[PDB]
Amino acid sequence: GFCPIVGGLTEAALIRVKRPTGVKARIFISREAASRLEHTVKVKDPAAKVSVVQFELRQSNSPDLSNWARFVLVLFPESFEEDAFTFWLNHGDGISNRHAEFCNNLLDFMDSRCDEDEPDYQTCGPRSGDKPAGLPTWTNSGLEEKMVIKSVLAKCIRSENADMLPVQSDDVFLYSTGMMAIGKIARAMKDDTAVIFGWLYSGTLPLVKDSGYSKPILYGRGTEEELDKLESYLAAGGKCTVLFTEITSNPQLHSPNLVRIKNLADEYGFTVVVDDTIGTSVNLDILPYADVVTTSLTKIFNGACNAMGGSLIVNPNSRHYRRIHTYLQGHFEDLLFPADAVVLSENCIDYPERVKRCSATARAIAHFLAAHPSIDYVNYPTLVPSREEYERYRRDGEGYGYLLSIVFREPDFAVRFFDALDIWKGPSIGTNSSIALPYSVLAPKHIVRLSVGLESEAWLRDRVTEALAKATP
Protein backbone atom coordinates (compact mmCIF):
# COMPACT_ATOMS: atom_id res chain seq x y z
CA GLY A 1 0.00 0.00 0.00
CA PHE A 2 1.94 3.00 -1.32
CA CYS A 3 1.02 6.44 -0.04
CA PRO A 4 -1.39 8.29 -0.47
CA ILE A 5 -3.85 5.80 1.06
CA VAL A 6 -7.63 5.81 0.57
CA GLY A 7 -9.74 3.97 3.09
CA GLY A 8 -7.82 2.65 6.07
CA LEU A 9 -10.06 4.01 8.83
CA THR A 10 -10.85 0.49 10.06
CA GLU A 11 -7.20 -0.61 9.96
CA ALA A 12 -6.09 2.58 11.73
CA ALA A 13 -8.78 2.26 14.41
CA LEU A 14 -7.82 -1.38 14.99
CA ILE A 15 -4.19 -0.34 15.51
CA ARG A 16 -5.22 2.34 18.01
CA VAL A 17 -6.91 -0.30 20.20
CA LYS A 18 -4.13 -2.91 19.75
CA ARG A 19 -6.46 -5.32 17.89
CA PRO A 20 -4.94 -5.45 14.39
CA THR A 21 -5.47 -9.23 14.32
CA GLY A 22 -8.01 -11.79 15.50
CA VAL A 23 -11.21 -9.70 15.41
CA LYS A 24 -13.66 -8.48 12.84
CA ALA A 25 -14.60 -4.83 12.79
CA ARG A 26 -17.46 -2.58 11.71
CA ILE A 27 -17.78 1.19 11.97
CA PHE A 28 -21.13 2.92 12.48
CA ILE A 29 -21.93 6.53 13.32
CA SER A 30 -24.59 5.67 15.92
CA ARG A 31 -24.38 3.71 19.15
CA GLU A 32 -27.80 2.22 18.34
CA ALA A 33 -26.68 0.55 15.10
CA ALA A 34 -23.54 -0.72 16.84
CA SER A 35 -25.75 -2.36 19.47
CA ARG A 36 -27.95 -4.07 16.87
CA LEU A 37 -24.84 -5.81 15.52
CA GLU A 38 -23.65 -6.71 19.03
CA HIS A 39 -27.04 -8.26 19.76
CA THR A 40 -27.04 -10.36 16.58
CA VAL A 41 -23.58 -11.74 17.38
CA LYS A 42 -24.63 -12.43 20.98
CA VAL A 43 -27.71 -14.34 19.87
CA LYS A 44 -25.62 -16.71 17.88
CA ASP A 45 -23.11 -17.02 20.70
CA PRO A 46 -23.92 -15.54 24.14
CA ALA A 47 -20.26 -15.96 25.18
CA ALA A 48 -18.77 -14.00 22.22
CA LYS A 49 -16.45 -11.10 23.10
CA VAL A 50 -18.07 -8.05 21.47
CA SER A 51 -16.74 -4.61 22.35
CA VAL A 52 -18.12 -1.23 21.35
CA VAL A 53 -15.50 1.52 21.27
CA GLN A 54 -16.56 5.14 20.82
CA PHE A 55 -14.14 7.41 18.98
CA GLU A 56 -14.68 11.15 19.29
CA LEU A 57 -12.83 14.42 18.91
CA ARG A 58 -12.56 15.52 22.53
CA GLN A 59 -11.58 19.20 22.73
CA SER A 60 -12.62 21.74 20.12
CA ASN A 61 -14.24 25.19 19.75
CA SER A 62 -15.57 24.06 16.35
CA PRO A 63 -18.91 22.24 16.72
CA ASP A 64 -18.73 21.10 13.08
CA LEU A 65 -15.68 18.96 13.80
CA SER A 66 -16.91 17.74 17.19
CA ASN A 67 -20.32 16.76 15.78
CA TRP A 68 -18.98 14.80 12.79
CA ALA A 69 -15.47 13.67 13.84
CA ARG A 70 -17.02 10.74 15.71
CA PHE A 71 -17.62 7.07 14.98
CA VAL A 72 -18.31 3.78 16.75
CA LEU A 73 -15.99 0.79 16.29
CA VAL A 74 -17.43 -2.69 16.91
CA LEU A 75 -15.08 -5.61 17.57
CA PHE A 76 -16.35 -9.19 17.44
CA PRO A 77 -14.77 -12.58 16.71
CA GLU A 78 -14.10 -13.72 13.17
CA SER A 79 -15.97 -16.93 14.02
CA PHE A 80 -19.19 -14.99 13.44
CA GLU A 81 -20.22 -15.26 9.79
CA GLU A 82 -22.34 -12.32 8.66
CA ASP A 83 -25.93 -13.13 7.69
CA ALA A 84 -28.47 -11.10 5.70
CA PHE A 85 -29.30 -8.69 8.53
CA THR A 86 -25.76 -7.68 9.52
CA PHE A 87 -25.08 -7.16 5.82
CA TRP A 88 -28.00 -4.75 5.46
CA LEU A 89 -27.40 -3.26 8.91
CA ASN A 90 -23.87 -2.34 7.81
CA HIS A 91 -25.10 -1.36 4.34
CA GLY A 92 -27.62 1.05 5.85
CA ASP A 93 -25.74 2.18 8.96
CA GLY A 94 -22.10 1.82 7.94
CA ILE A 95 -20.09 5.02 7.90
CA SER A 96 -20.07 6.62 4.47
CA ASN A 97 -16.87 6.66 2.42
CA ARG A 98 -16.49 10.44 2.70
CA HIS A 99 -17.28 10.33 6.43
CA ALA A 100 -14.70 7.56 6.90
CA GLU A 101 -12.03 9.57 5.08
CA PHE A 102 -12.92 12.67 7.13
CA CYS A 103 -12.49 10.73 10.38
CA ASN A 104 -9.23 9.12 9.28
CA ASN A 105 -7.71 12.54 8.55
CA LEU A 106 -8.66 13.61 12.10
CA LEU A 107 -8.05 10.30 13.90
CA ASP A 108 -4.93 11.66 15.63
CA PHE A 109 -7.13 14.35 17.25
CA MET A 110 -9.65 11.78 18.54
CA ASP A 111 -9.81 9.73 21.73
CA SER A 112 -11.37 6.32 22.33
CA ARG A 113 -13.42 5.22 25.34
CA CYS A 114 -15.25 1.99 26.10
CA ASP A 115 -17.89 1.20 28.71
CA GLU A 116 -16.45 -2.26 29.38
CA ASP A 117 -13.21 -2.41 31.38
CA GLU A 118 -10.70 -2.92 28.59
CA PRO A 119 -7.73 -0.56 29.09
CA ASP A 120 -6.52 -1.18 25.52
CA TYR A 121 -9.68 0.64 24.36
CA GLN A 122 -9.09 3.77 26.49
CA THR A 123 -6.68 5.75 24.32
CA CYS A 124 -5.74 9.42 23.99
CA GLY A 125 -5.07 10.79 20.53
CA PRO A 126 -1.49 11.90 19.85
CA ARG A 127 -2.75 15.35 18.78
CA SER A 128 -5.87 15.57 20.96
CA GLY A 129 -6.57 19.20 21.85
CA ASP A 130 -4.43 20.65 19.06
CA LYS A 131 -5.94 22.42 16.13
CA PRO A 132 -6.25 20.47 12.88
CA ALA A 133 -4.25 21.73 9.94
CA GLY A 134 -7.42 21.83 7.82
CA LEU A 135 -11.04 22.89 8.13
CA PRO A 136 -13.56 21.13 5.82
CA THR A 137 -14.91 23.06 2.85
CA TRP A 138 -18.51 22.52 3.92
CA THR A 139 -20.03 24.65 6.67
CA ASN A 140 -22.84 24.40 9.24
CA SER A 141 -23.06 20.60 9.00
CA GLY A 142 -24.08 21.04 5.36
CA LEU A 143 -27.49 22.33 6.46
CA GLU A 144 -27.56 24.67 3.46
CA GLU A 145 -27.09 21.71 1.12
CA LYS A 146 -29.52 19.56 3.12
CA MET A 147 -32.25 22.16 2.62
CA VAL A 148 -31.65 22.10 -1.14
CA ILE A 149 -32.07 18.32 -1.01
CA LYS A 150 -35.28 18.56 1.04
CA SER A 151 -36.62 21.31 -1.22
CA VAL A 152 -36.09 19.32 -4.43
CA LEU A 153 -37.60 16.18 -2.88
CA ALA A 154 -40.63 18.15 -1.68
CA LYS A 155 -41.16 19.74 -5.10
CA CYS A 156 -40.72 16.50 -7.04
CA ILE A 157 -43.25 14.64 -4.88
CA ARG A 158 -45.93 17.32 -5.33
CA SER A 159 -49.12 15.70 -6.59
CA GLU A 160 -50.36 16.74 -10.02
CA ASN A 161 -53.76 17.09 -8.31
CA ALA A 162 -54.44 20.30 -6.42
CA ASP A 163 -56.70 19.05 -3.67
CA MET A 164 -53.83 17.92 -1.48
CA LEU A 165 -51.57 19.86 0.89
CA PRO A 166 -48.12 20.08 -0.69
CA VAL A 167 -45.17 18.40 0.94
CA GLN A 168 -42.98 20.99 2.63
CA SER A 169 -39.22 21.04 3.20
CA ASP A 170 -39.65 20.07 6.86
CA ASP A 171 -41.85 17.06 6.05
CA VAL A 172 -38.71 15.53 4.49
CA PHE A 173 -36.26 13.71 6.76
CA LEU A 174 -32.73 12.96 5.54
CA TYR A 175 -30.74 9.94 6.69
CA SER A 176 -27.46 8.27 5.80
CA THR A 177 -28.89 5.72 3.35
CA GLY A 178 -32.19 4.61 1.89
CA MET A 179 -31.88 1.51 4.07
CA MET A 180 -31.60 3.65 7.20
CA ALA A 181 -34.64 5.66 6.13
CA ILE A 182 -36.53 2.35 5.91
CA GLY A 183 -35.36 1.33 9.33
CA LYS A 184 -36.31 4.56 10.97
CA ILE A 185 -39.86 4.41 9.67
CA ALA A 186 -40.15 0.74 10.77
CA ARG A 187 -39.36 1.52 14.41
CA ALA A 188 -41.66 4.55 14.27
CA MET A 189 -44.52 2.23 13.35
CA LYS A 190 -43.58 -0.20 16.14
CA ASP A 191 -44.37 2.46 18.80
CA ASP A 192 -50.05 -4.63 15.60
CA THR A 193 -48.71 -6.43 12.52
CA ALA A 194 -46.69 -5.37 9.48
CA VAL A 195 -47.33 -6.43 5.87
CA ILE A 196 -44.63 -6.72 3.19
CA PHE A 197 -46.27 -6.43 -0.23
CA GLY A 198 -44.14 -7.38 -3.24
CA TRP A 199 -40.88 -5.67 -2.22
CA LEU A 200 -37.89 -7.77 -3.27
CA TYR A 201 -35.21 -5.25 -2.28
CA SER A 202 -33.49 -7.86 -0.11
CA GLY A 203 -32.78 -5.45 2.73
CA THR A 204 -36.32 -4.39 3.65
CA LEU A 205 -37.48 -7.63 5.30
CA PRO A 206 -34.39 -8.00 7.57
CA LEU A 207 -34.73 -4.44 8.88
CA VAL A 208 -38.49 -4.66 9.45
CA LYS A 209 -37.93 -7.92 11.33
CA ASP A 210 -35.10 -6.39 13.37
CA SER A 211 -37.28 -3.39 14.26
CA GLY A 212 -39.58 -5.59 16.38
CA TYR A 213 -41.91 -7.20 13.81
CA SER A 214 -41.00 -10.80 14.49
CA LYS A 215 -42.81 -12.20 11.52
CA PRO A 216 -44.48 -9.88 9.09
CA ILE A 217 -47.13 -11.03 6.65
CA LEU A 218 -45.18 -11.49 3.42
CA TYR A 219 -47.01 -11.18 0.09
CA GLY A 220 -44.19 -11.87 -2.33
CA ARG A 221 -45.79 -11.15 -5.70
CA GLY A 222 -47.79 -8.01 -4.97
CA THR A 223 -50.83 -9.25 -6.88
CA GLU A 224 -54.50 -8.53 -6.58
CA GLU A 225 -54.94 -12.09 -5.43
CA GLU A 226 -52.68 -11.36 -2.45
CA LEU A 227 -54.66 -8.19 -1.75
CA ASP A 228 -57.71 -10.47 -1.55
CA LYS A 229 -56.03 -12.52 1.18
CA LEU A 230 -55.10 -9.30 3.01
CA GLU A 231 -58.65 -7.96 2.75
CA SER A 232 -60.09 -11.31 3.87
CA TYR A 233 -57.84 -11.15 6.94
CA LEU A 234 -58.78 -7.53 7.68
CA ALA A 235 -62.51 -8.06 7.17
CA ALA A 236 -62.38 -11.02 9.57
CA GLY A 237 -61.05 -8.74 12.33
CA GLY A 238 -57.33 -9.03 11.67
CA LYS A 239 -55.36 -5.89 12.43
CA CYS A 240 -52.43 -4.30 10.59
CA THR A 241 -50.25 -1.38 11.63
CA VAL A 242 -48.19 -0.74 8.48
CA LEU A 243 -47.87 -2.01 4.91
CA PHE A 244 -44.52 -1.80 3.11
CA THR A 245 -44.40 -1.76 -0.69
CA GLU A 246 -42.35 -0.27 -3.47
CA ILE A 247 -43.66 1.35 -6.60
CA THR A 248 -42.09 -0.15 -9.60
CA SER A 249 -40.61 -3.34 -8.36
CA ASN A 250 -37.25 -4.93 -8.79
CA PRO A 251 -36.54 -6.66 -11.16
CA GLN A 252 -39.95 -7.37 -12.75
CA LEU A 253 -41.04 -3.69 -12.92
CA HIS A 254 -44.41 -4.54 -11.39
CA SER A 255 -46.74 -1.79 -10.17
CA PRO A 256 -48.75 -2.47 -7.01
CA ASN A 257 -52.38 -1.38 -6.83
CA LEU A 258 -51.85 1.69 -4.66
CA VAL A 259 -55.46 2.87 -5.06
CA ARG A 260 -56.82 -0.36 -3.58
CA ILE A 261 -54.08 -0.41 -0.93
CA LYS A 262 -54.98 3.13 0.12
CA ASN A 263 -58.67 2.20 0.22
CA LEU A 264 -57.99 -0.78 2.49
CA ALA A 265 -55.77 1.46 4.62
CA ASP A 266 -58.55 4.03 5.03
CA GLU A 267 -61.04 1.27 5.88
CA TYR A 268 -58.92 -0.84 8.25
CA GLY A 269 -56.54 1.82 9.60
CA PHE A 270 -52.93 0.97 8.70
CA THR A 271 -50.11 3.17 7.45
CA VAL A 272 -48.80 2.83 3.88
CA VAL A 273 -45.04 3.11 3.26
CA VAL A 274 -44.11 3.33 -0.43
CA ASP A 275 -40.57 3.28 -1.81
CA ASP A 276 -40.30 5.28 -5.05
CA THR A 277 -36.58 4.70 -5.62
CA ILE A 278 -37.16 2.77 -8.85
CA GLY A 279 -40.41 4.30 -9.98
CA THR A 280 -39.37 7.86 -9.24
CA SER A 281 -41.28 10.81 -8.07
CA VAL A 282 -40.50 12.52 -11.38
CA ASN A 283 -42.44 9.88 -13.34
CA LEU A 284 -45.08 8.91 -10.76
CA ASP A 285 -47.62 10.75 -8.60
CA ILE A 286 -48.07 8.45 -5.59
CA LEU A 287 -48.58 11.04 -2.84
CA PRO A 288 -52.40 10.47 -2.80
CA TYR A 289 -51.88 6.82 -1.80
CA ALA A 290 -48.89 6.85 0.59
CA ASP A 291 -48.57 8.02 4.18
CA VAL A 292 -44.76 7.85 4.03
CA VAL A 293 -42.57 7.84 0.91
CA THR A 294 -39.02 6.50 1.16
CA THR A 295 -36.28 7.08 -1.41
CA SER A 296 -32.69 5.93 -1.82
CA LEU A 297 -30.91 9.16 -2.78
CA THR A 298 -27.82 7.05 -3.58
CA LYS A 299 -29.60 5.97 -6.77
CA ILE A 300 -30.82 8.09 -9.69
CA PHE A 301 -31.52 11.02 -7.36
CA ASN A 302 -27.72 11.38 -7.36
CA GLY A 303 -26.80 9.44 -10.51
CA ALA A 304 -23.05 9.81 -10.05
CA CYS A 305 -22.48 6.80 -7.74
CA ASN A 306 -20.30 8.89 -5.42
CA ALA A 307 -22.51 9.69 -2.41
CA MET A 308 -25.05 8.06 -0.09
CA GLY A 309 -28.34 9.43 1.13
CA GLY A 310 -31.83 8.42 2.12
CA SER A 311 -35.01 10.41 2.48
CA LEU A 312 -38.27 10.05 4.39
CA ILE A 313 -41.28 12.09 3.28
CA VAL A 314 -44.24 12.32 5.66
CA ASN A 315 -47.41 13.11 3.73
CA PRO A 316 -49.18 16.14 5.27
CA ASN A 317 -52.42 14.71 3.84
CA SER A 318 -52.05 11.54 5.93
CA ARG A 319 -54.37 10.80 8.84
CA HIS A 320 -51.22 9.83 10.77
CA TYR A 321 -49.15 12.88 9.83
CA ARG A 322 -49.18 14.22 13.35
CA ARG A 323 -48.14 11.03 15.02
CA ILE A 324 -45.62 10.04 12.44
CA HIS A 325 -43.95 13.40 12.08
CA THR A 326 -43.72 13.91 15.85
CA TYR A 327 -41.97 10.57 16.36
CA LEU A 328 -39.47 11.20 13.56
CA GLN A 329 -38.82 14.76 14.70
CA GLY A 330 -38.55 13.76 18.36
CA HIS A 331 -36.09 10.97 17.50
CA PHE A 332 -34.13 12.75 14.75
CA GLU A 333 -30.35 12.98 14.89
CA ASP A 334 -28.56 14.08 11.70
CA LEU A 335 -26.46 11.21 10.34
CA LEU A 336 -26.12 12.39 6.72
CA PHE A 337 -22.46 13.40 6.57
CA PRO A 338 -22.21 16.95 5.12
CA ALA A 339 -19.78 16.08 2.29
CA ASP A 340 -22.31 13.53 1.05
CA ALA A 341 -25.09 16.14 1.22
CA VAL A 342 -22.97 18.58 -0.79
CA VAL A 343 -22.68 16.15 -3.70
CA LEU A 344 -26.36 15.16 -3.42
CA SER A 345 -27.49 18.80 -3.41
CA GLU A 346 -25.43 19.49 -6.54
CA ASN A 347 -26.42 16.38 -8.49
CA CYS A 348 -30.14 16.52 -7.65
CA ILE A 349 -30.60 19.90 -9.37
CA ASP A 350 -31.06 18.02 -12.67
CA TYR A 351 -32.60 14.88 -11.16
CA PRO A 352 -35.89 15.45 -13.06
CA GLU A 353 -34.09 15.87 -16.39
CA ARG A 354 -31.90 12.79 -15.91
CA VAL A 355 -34.89 10.61 -15.03
CA LYS A 356 -36.66 11.90 -18.14
CA ARG A 357 -33.63 11.14 -20.32
CA CYS A 358 -32.89 7.67 -18.92
CA SER A 359 -36.59 6.76 -19.13
CA ALA A 360 -36.70 7.76 -22.81
CA THR A 361 -33.69 5.57 -23.61
CA ALA A 362 -34.91 2.70 -21.43
CA ARG A 363 -38.29 2.70 -23.17
CA ALA A 364 -36.60 2.60 -26.58
CA ILE A 365 -34.06 -0.06 -25.59
CA ALA A 366 -36.76 -2.24 -24.00
CA HIS A 367 -38.83 -2.17 -27.19
CA PHE A 368 -35.67 -2.90 -29.19
CA LEU A 369 -34.93 -5.87 -26.92
CA ALA A 370 -38.53 -7.12 -27.05
CA ALA A 371 -38.34 -7.38 -30.86
CA HIS A 372 -35.29 -9.61 -30.78
CA PRO A 373 -35.85 -13.31 -31.58
CA SER A 374 -33.64 -14.48 -28.69
CA ILE A 375 -35.70 -12.58 -26.08
CA ASP A 376 -38.73 -14.30 -24.56
CA TYR A 377 -40.05 -11.07 -23.02
CA VAL A 378 -38.84 -7.83 -21.45
CA ASN A 379 -39.97 -6.56 -18.04
CA TYR A 380 -40.58 -2.78 -18.47
CA PRO A 381 -43.71 -0.91 -17.26
CA THR A 382 -44.88 -0.49 -20.88
CA LEU A 383 -44.83 -4.19 -21.56
CA VAL A 384 -45.60 -5.96 -18.24
CA PRO A 385 -49.16 -7.08 -17.28
CA SER A 386 -49.49 -4.19 -14.80
CA ARG A 387 -49.21 -1.90 -17.83
CA GLU A 388 -52.58 -0.42 -17.06
CA GLU A 389 -51.74 0.06 -13.35
CA TYR A 390 -48.64 2.16 -14.06
CA GLU A 391 -50.74 4.59 -16.12
CA ARG A 392 -52.89 5.42 -13.08
CA TYR A 393 -49.89 7.08 -11.39
CA ARG A 394 -47.80 8.25 -14.35
CA ARG A 395 -47.58 12.03 -14.64
CA ASP A 396 -48.57 13.54 -17.98
CA GLY A 397 -45.56 14.06 -20.22
CA GLU A 398 -43.36 11.70 -18.17
CA GLY A 399 -42.02 8.29 -19.10
CA TYR A 400 -41.83 4.75 -17.80
CA GLY A 401 -38.62 4.60 -15.78
CA TYR A 402 -34.99 3.62 -16.22
CA LEU A 403 -35.02 0.02 -14.96
CA LEU A 404 -35.84 -3.04 -17.05
CA SER A 405 -35.00 -6.73 -17.10
CA ILE A 406 -34.59 -9.24 -19.92
CA VAL A 407 -35.97 -12.78 -19.85
CA PHE A 408 -34.13 -14.64 -22.59
CA ARG A 409 -35.37 -17.76 -24.34
CA GLU A 410 -32.31 -19.84 -23.41
CA PRO A 411 -30.36 -19.50 -20.13
CA ASP A 412 -27.20 -20.43 -22.05
CA PHE A 413 -27.78 -17.43 -24.34
CA ALA A 414 -28.42 -15.17 -21.33
CA VAL A 415 -24.98 -15.86 -19.86
CA ARG A 416 -23.18 -15.47 -23.19
CA PHE A 417 -25.04 -12.19 -23.74
CA PHE A 418 -24.13 -10.81 -20.32
CA ASP A 419 -20.45 -11.72 -20.69
CA ALA A 420 -20.28 -10.04 -24.12
CA LEU A 421 -22.05 -6.86 -22.93
CA ASP A 422 -19.43 -4.08 -22.70
CA ILE A 423 -21.18 -1.96 -20.07
CA TRP A 424 -20.71 -1.53 -16.34
CA LYS A 425 -21.58 -4.61 -14.28
CA GLY A 426 -22.61 -4.49 -10.64
CA PRO A 427 -25.50 -4.38 -8.17
CA SER A 428 -26.26 -0.66 -8.18
CA ILE A 429 -29.05 1.06 -10.14
CA GLY A 430 -29.92 4.63 -11.01
CA THR A 431 -26.52 5.50 -12.36
CA ASN A 432 -25.49 7.89 -15.11
CA SER A 433 -23.83 4.96 -16.80
CA SER A 434 -25.73 1.86 -17.87
CA ILE A 435 -25.23 -1.21 -15.70
CA ALA A 436 -26.24 -4.87 -15.94
CA LEU A 437 -26.57 -7.79 -13.52
CA PRO A 438 -27.88 -11.36 -13.61
CA TYR A 439 -30.24 -12.87 -11.01
CA SER A 440 -27.35 -15.01 -9.71
CA VAL A 441 -25.54 -12.15 -8.02
CA LEU A 442 -28.86 -10.74 -6.82
CA ALA A 443 -28.80 -13.57 -4.23
CA PRO A 444 -36.66 -17.15 -14.00
CA LYS A 445 -33.17 -17.21 -12.53
CA HIS A 446 -31.38 -16.50 -15.83
CA ILE A 447 -32.95 -13.03 -15.98
CA VAL A 448 -30.68 -10.07 -16.73
CA ARG A 449 -31.47 -6.67 -15.23
CA LEU A 450 -30.49 -3.42 -16.95
CA SER A 451 -30.45 0.06 -15.41
CA VAL A 452 -30.25 2.50 -18.31
CA GLY A 453 -28.05 5.57 -17.87
CA LEU A 454 -27.56 8.77 -19.84
CA GLU A 455 -25.79 7.26 -22.86
CA SER A 456 -27.45 7.84 -26.21
CA GLU A 457 -29.87 5.29 -27.64
CA ALA A 458 -27.44 4.68 -30.51
CA TRP A 459 -24.64 3.95 -28.02
CA LEU A 460 -26.74 1.53 -25.96
CA ARG A 461 -28.34 -0.03 -29.05
CA ASP A 462 -24.80 -0.67 -30.31
CA ARG A 463 -23.47 -2.22 -27.09
CA VAL A 464 -26.48 -4.56 -26.97
CA THR A 465 -26.37 -5.50 -30.67
CA GLU A 466 -22.69 -6.46 -30.47
CA ALA A 467 -23.39 -8.48 -27.32
CA LEU A 468 -26.38 -10.14 -28.98
CA ALA A 469 -24.25 -11.08 -32.00
CA LYS A 470 -21.43 -12.64 -29.97
CA ALA A 471 -23.95 -14.68 -27.95
CA THR A 472 -25.26 -16.47 -31.06
CA PRO A 473 -23.24 -19.35 -32.55
Per CB under 8 A, residues contacting its own copies are 1-7, 11-12, 15, 18, 20, 91, 96-97, 101, 105, 108, 126-127, 133-134, 137, 298-299, 304-308, 342-343, 346-347, 349-350, 422-424, 426-428, 431-433, 453-456, 459
What is the H or E stretch that residue 205 is in? helix 204-210
237's contact among its own copies, Cl ion, none, with CB below 5 to 8 A by partner kind, is none
70's contact among Cl ion, its own copies, none, with CB below 5 to 8 A by partner kind, is none
422's contact among Cl ion, its own copies, none, with CB below 5 to 8 A by partner kind, is its own copies
Got the DSSP string for 226-293? HHHHHHHHHHTT---SEEEEESS-TTT-----HHHHHHHHHHHT-EEEEE-TTT-TTTB--GGG-SEE
Nearest in space to 248 (alpha carbons), one of 400, 362, 366, 370: 400
Q: How far is the CB of 414 from its own copies (least distance, A)?
A: 18
Nearest in space to 9 (alpha carbons), one of 95, 90, 86: 95
Closest CB to its own copies among residues 187, 299: 299
What is the H or E stretch that residue 216 is in? none
349's contact among its own copies, Cl ion, none, with CB below 5 to 8 A by partner kind, is its own copies
260's contact among Cl ion, its own copies, none, with CB below 5 to 8 A by partner kind, is Cl ion
Q: How far is the CB of 359 from Cl ion (least distance, A)?
A: 25
Closest CB to Cl ion among residues 194, 264: 264
Determine whether 191 is exposed, middle or buried from the number of CB atoms within 10 Å of its CB (0-12, 13-18, 19+).
exposed
Q: How far is the CB of 441 from its own copies (least distance, A)?
A: 10
Q: How far is the CB of 257 from Cl ion (least distance, A)?
A: 6
Closest CB to its own copies among residues 252, 431: 431
Closest CB to its own copies among residues 267, 422: 422
- Give CA–CA dist 277/219, Å, rounded: 20
Chain-centre distance of CA 223, in angstroms?
Answer: 24
Task: Return residues touching Cl ion (CB under 5 A).
Answer: 259-260
Q: How far is the CB of 3 from its own copies (least distance, A)?
A: 3
- Give CA–CA dist 2/332, Å, rounded: 41
Q: How far is the CB of 153 from its own copies (least distance, A)?
A: 16
- Give CA–CA dist 20/433, Å, rounded: 38
Residues near 367 by beta carbon (within 8 Å), at least 6 away in sequence: 378, 382, 383
259's contact among its own copies, Cl ion, none, with CB below 5 to 8 A by partner kind, is Cl ion
